[PDB]
Every structure is written in structure tokens, then in C-alpha cells.
């Protein structure tokens, strides 16, 4: 409603670096808000794509940002009559970033890993890795829970059970208020999908450079399964957290599986022990139901509500014809211990191939009316197909079925404006929560400031 579409702020990165693929707000020890941006195709040292991370200070003008420097050198360690190898070429550092306290978590879901023992090997596979930084102090650490030292032959013998070689850990990420990093790995367990949790503080204290393979005792991975419904479901494509059990001491996990049960797609709510509470099933196949999940209380009953994106949903139209436009589902949490029923609201896109639902960001209370609001992206929607971000306001009965404001892309065609979103943070300190939008196609980030309601 009251986002300023006239005087934007533009941050920009190198050409072809995909600057804006992922972003988040970052507060330092003094509460001064900044913006962390991931550029998963930034050139490394060897003139090869490795990705990179930038930490933009807040300036109404915008501009270039300083880099958040990470180690981009391939590593090798000969130990235990084995050779451990990491390959950071084309790893996509910055394909997801997330902030919590004065710490940044930037991940490279396609960092490759291999172990050599004489003539055998573990196979060079993308286990994924995340890099952690404390910008003020300069502390650094890494976390890669799917790294293993089991040779290729053993996996064949034990029939690929517990195969964490293709995790791509860091694909999606989130951090609980208690400080527990939760990585999504859609490729764990041979493209079944796993989740990996570990306290941030334990990551920093149990990391030393050059070790490559080290233990984190407080970590907790999910479990393999022999159920064909989870086969090629990419459990962990998107991840989020919230409160869905009634107990305020436990933190619950929301996981997307957009190809679950033969591309039916699903979303599952779990406890911190990965035990399944509820399971929302997809409505239409290949709709990619679960591509994005968001958690916020939209109806103001203190109970977190759930939002699920299915950006390929094909809407039914006249003459038995379908039209891919995308769709978003709203689930309102019921009072007390009860299952989440049917969707409370269906928001369906309008622009063909617009992918309405590719990204969903809680905005907090934008117009300051008592209900939290959200923003939904259609990165190839709008009358020009350049991209659109629609805002939907909260109300006593859920959400409004029609948008209050629509942000058209200021970038050229193909910018993927809206592919990443983040809101609910006041960055100019005017009392109103703001919105940052990424357009990796144009390698820029646009900041929309919320202003008093006209």
C-alpha cells in the first residue's frame, strides 16, 4: 500500500555476477542495518566463476558495495592414508544468504568434494558448503555436514543408503531466534532431501582451517527413508521456521518438497527432532508446490500462519484450456492442537509464464493497521513480462484477495525482478518496515522505502 515506488535506491554489482540472487538485512552490534547480497557467479582469483558476497551500507543513493571476503582457494589435505579435496569452481557462493545477530551465513550449494584412497575415490560430487562471517571482528568459519570419507564402492554395496554425496547443503537456509542454523539440502540421500541443523556458536568453536573433515557434536541431520513418495522430491528446496505446536520452548521447521510423490509436491511441518506434524499436499503436478515457504501471523491471532508458493500452477480457463500463471496458498493455524485444514485463500497469478509465487516475503505491518502483510513476486509477470511484486494486506479473516500495491520492474527485460525478497526491517529508521528486491538478471538490488499512508 504505502511503499514508495517513485524514489527507489539501487545497489549494483559486477556484470554477469548474478548480484541479487539472494539477500537479507544485517544488523551489526550497534543495530545499524545493512544489506547482504549474494552473487553466485562472481569471478574468483583464477578468473573463474566462484561466487561472492557483498555487504552494502545503507545509503539512499545506493551504488557499489564492498566485498565480504572469503577463502576461494581449492583445498587439499593428505591424512589417514587418504586425500581430501575441495573444489570451489562454479560453487555458487551467495546462492543463499541469511543473517542472525552480527553473523552472516553465505552458502555455496554446488561446492564439490572428493576423497582419494590409492585408486578408489568417493566421486567428485556437490556436497555443498556454507561460509560464516562476523564482519566487525573478522572471524570466519565453514560448515559442510554432508562431507564424508566413504569410498564409492561401499555406497554401491550398502545400496546407496545414507548417501550424502550430492547434498548441495546451503541450497536454502534459515536461522532460528535461538541461533540454530538450518540448511536445506535437496540432494541428500540420493535426491531424497535432508535438513541439517547446528548451533552457530558451536560451528565457530569447532572449526579450524585446513581440517576439511571435522565433527560438530551438537548437529542434527534428518533421516533417510525407503518410501518412494520421497524419491526425487528435493526435500529441502525451501525452508522456514515458526511456532505450530503450541509449545513456545520448541522451534518447528517448515520444509518444501516441490517434486514430492511424483512431482505432486508437498510441504511438511516438523519438530526440532524432524518428526512430522502436518503435511500439506500439492494441488497439481509439476506446479512445484513448495518452491517457496514463508511464515508470519497475518490475521493477528499470535499464531503463525503458513504460505506456500506453487509458481508453475496452471489455472483452468475457458474451452478446457490451461494457463501457467502461478498460485499462492494461505494456511491459517487453528486455535490449539488441531491440524491445518484446507487453504484459507487462493491467490492466483494473471500473467502467463509469470511464475506468481516464486518468492514470498513477510513484510511485517506495512500500513501499521495491526495485521502483518506479505509480498509475492511474479518475476516474469506484469503486462510487459518484466516482473512484478504484489503486496497483500492482512485482515481479521486472513488476507485480502486483491493486492493493495503493485511494484513494476524498473529493470530491463529478463532481470528476474522479484526472484528474491526480504522485508519486515526498518532500514531508514522512520518507523515503517521496508522491502528489498533482487534482480540478478540485471545484477542490481532495489530498495523500496515505506512511507506514511497517503
Amino acid at each position, epitope marked *: 500500500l504505502n511503499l514508495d515506488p517513485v524514489q527507489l535506491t539501487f545497489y549494483a554489482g559486477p556484470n554477469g555476477s548474478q548480484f541479487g540472487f539472494s539477500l537479507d538485512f544485517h544488523k551489526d552490534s550497534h543495530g545499524r542495518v545493512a544489506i547482504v547480497v549474494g552473487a553466485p557467479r562472481t569471478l574468483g582469483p583464477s578468473q573463474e566463476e566462484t561466487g561472492g558476497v557483498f555487504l552494502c551500507p545503507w545509503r539512499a543513493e545506493g551504488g557499489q558495495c564492498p566485498s565480504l571476503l572469503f577463502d576461494l582457494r581449492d583445498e587439499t589435505r*593428505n591424512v*589417514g*592414508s587418504q586425500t581430501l579435496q575441495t573444489f570451489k569452481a562454479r560453487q555458487g557462493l551467495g546462492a543463499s544468504v541469511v543473517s542472525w545477530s552480527d553473523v552472516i551465513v553465505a552458502c555455496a550449494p554446488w561446492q564439490h568434494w572428493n576423497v582419494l584412497e590409492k585408486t578408489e575415490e568417493a566421486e567428485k560430487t556437490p556436497v555443498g558448503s556454507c561460509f560464516l562471517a562476523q564482519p566487525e571482528s573478522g572471524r570466519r568459519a565453514e560448515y559442510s555436514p554432508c562431507r564424508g570419507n566413504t569410498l564409492s564402492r561401499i555406497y554401491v554395496e550398502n545400496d546407496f543408503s545414507w548417501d550424502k554425496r550430492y547434498c548441495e547443503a546451503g541450497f536454502s537456509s534459515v536461522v532460528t531466534q535461538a541461533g540454530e542454523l538450518v540448511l536445506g539440502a535437496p540432494g541428500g540421500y540420493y535426491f531424497l532431501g535432508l535438513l541439517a541443523q547446528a548451533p552457530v556458536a558451536d560451528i565457530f568453536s569447532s572449526y579450524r582451517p585446513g581440517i576439511l573433515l*571435522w565433527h560438530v557434536s551438537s548437529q542434527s541431520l534428518s533421516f533417510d527413508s525407503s518410501n518412494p513418495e520421497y524419491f526425487d522430491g528435493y526435500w529441502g528446496y525451501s525452508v522456514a521456521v515458526g511456532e505450530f505446536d503450541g509449545d513456545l520452548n520448541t522451534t518447528e521447521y517448515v520444509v518444501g518438497a516441490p517434486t514430492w510423490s511424483w512431482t505432486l509436491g508437498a510441504v511438511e511441518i516438523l519438530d526440532s527432532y524432524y518428526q512430522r506434524l502436518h503435511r500439506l499436499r500439492g494441488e497439481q503436478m509439476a506446479s512445484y508446490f513448495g518452491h517457496s515457504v514463508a511464515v508470519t501471523d497475518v490475521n493477528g491471532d499470535g499464531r503463525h500462519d503458513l504460505l506456500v508458493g506453487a509458481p508453475l500452477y496452471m489455472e483452468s480457463r475457458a474451452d478446457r484450456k490451461l494457463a501457467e500463471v502461478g498460485r499462492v496458498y494461505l494456511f491459517l493455524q487453528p486455535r490449539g492442537p488441531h491440524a491445518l485444514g484446507a487453504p484459507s485463500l487462493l491467490l492466483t497469478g494473471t500473467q502467463l509464464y509469470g511464475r506468481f509465487g516464486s518468492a514470498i516475503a513477510p513484510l511485517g505491518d506495512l500500513d501499521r493497521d495491526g495485521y502483518n502483510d506479505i509480498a509475492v513476486a511474479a518475476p516474469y509477470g506484469g503486462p510487459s513480462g518484466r516482473g512484478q511484486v504484489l503486496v497483500f494486506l492482512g485482515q481479521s479473516e486472513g488476507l485480502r484477495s486483491r493486492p493493495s500495491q503493485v511494484l513494476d520492474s524498473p529493470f530491463p527485460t529478463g532481470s528476474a525482478f522479484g526472484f528474491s525478497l526480504r522485508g519486515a526491517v526498518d532500514i531508514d529508521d522512520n518507523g515503517y518496515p521496508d522491502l528489498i528486491v533482487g534482480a540478478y538478471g540485471a545484477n542490481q538490488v532495489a530498495v523500496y522505502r515505506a512511507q506514511p499512508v497517503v
Partner: antibody
Amino acid sequence: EVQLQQSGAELVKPGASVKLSCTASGFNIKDTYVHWVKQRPEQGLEWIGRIDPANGYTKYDPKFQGKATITADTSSNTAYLQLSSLTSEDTAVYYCVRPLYDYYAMDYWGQGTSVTVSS
Amino acid sequence: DILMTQSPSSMSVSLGDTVSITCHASQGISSNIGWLQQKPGKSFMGLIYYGTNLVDGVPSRFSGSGSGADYSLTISSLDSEDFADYYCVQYAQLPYTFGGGTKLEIKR
């Protein structure tokens, strides 16, 4: 806290067999590797072998092939070392070891089990 | 196997002295070395892993260093508890092999 609580001292005859234990306290034995080390005053320290309790796979120094047999039961959170066809030279103190952070290190040590072979 | 030559076999020193134990290997091990302590008539405690990194709970007066095949354990300002045995162990290759040992003794 991490603590490895081994079995009590054993007193056995040559040619017989003995089976030592190493119970985990404050954690899961399945978490890391488990090594066994032999200590004598003259010969110093010697490395026997290791086991991954998650799957049972083991590695041994060629010197102990035949006498040492390492196993583990995730149920009782305990690891075992079996010695067969005992000898006067098998009279030594036996420790179990696990690493702290590095997958391959030797950091935490049990109190040790005192073995004496004698007729 | 890899031979761990630890030297000296023993040394007589006093409280507050800065002493240095060394460990020489039969081949490069690239900082894949650890350090151990066995107080008289007791078990072992970890000190160093991966050449330089301290084990949780160990004081900062200890320190490891060296590369290739030559490494060094150094104790700045000895304490009354620091009089015990000290062994180096390599894990660059299986089987793991230890040093002969080094006993710190009170000088008088």
C-alpha cells in the same frame, strides 16, 4: 562432558582370550572413530586399530592382525577389543581413543585397562 | 610405516622455564601431528591436534608449531602440573605411529 569409562583390570592365562570394553559417557559412541592403543614401558606406545561404530568397518596395524579384534554395539554405546592367544608380551595397558574435532585425531582417552598374562 | 623420532628423551628444568620438545618424522606429514600428556600414574590428555590447534580446556602457555617433517611443542613458563610425559603422534598415514616419549623432570 566426554568421558570414556573402560573395563577393570584383567588377569588371565596365556593362550586364553580376553575382551575389553570402552563405554561412552555423555555422548553417542556412534559419533566418531574409536581407536585402541597399547602401552608398554619399553616398547612405548603402539597403535592397534580403529572402528567406525556407525557401520562396523575397521582398520588394523599389520602387527596385530590375528590377535586384536575390534567390535562395537551401538545399543550399549560400548566398543570392544578382543585379544586372542595371549602371551607374556601381551601384558600391557590398553586405552581407547576418539578425536575431538578432527576426524582423524587422537584427543580423548579412557583411563586404561591393565592386562596381566601369567601362568 | 612412518617413524616418529622424538627428542630429547628427558630434560631437567625448573618452574618458569621455556622449554621446547621436538619431533622428527621419516617423511612429510603436513601438520598431521598431535601432542599428548600423561601425568604420573594416570591416563592421557589431548594437547594439540593438526600441528598447532589447542584442545578445549588446555591452557594457552602450550603451543605447537613446525611443518614438513619437523615439529615443536613449546611450554612458556612451566607450571608444577606440567611435569609429566609427552608423546607425539602422527596420523598422516595408517598405521598411526607414536614417538618414544619425553619426560619433564624437576631440576635441582
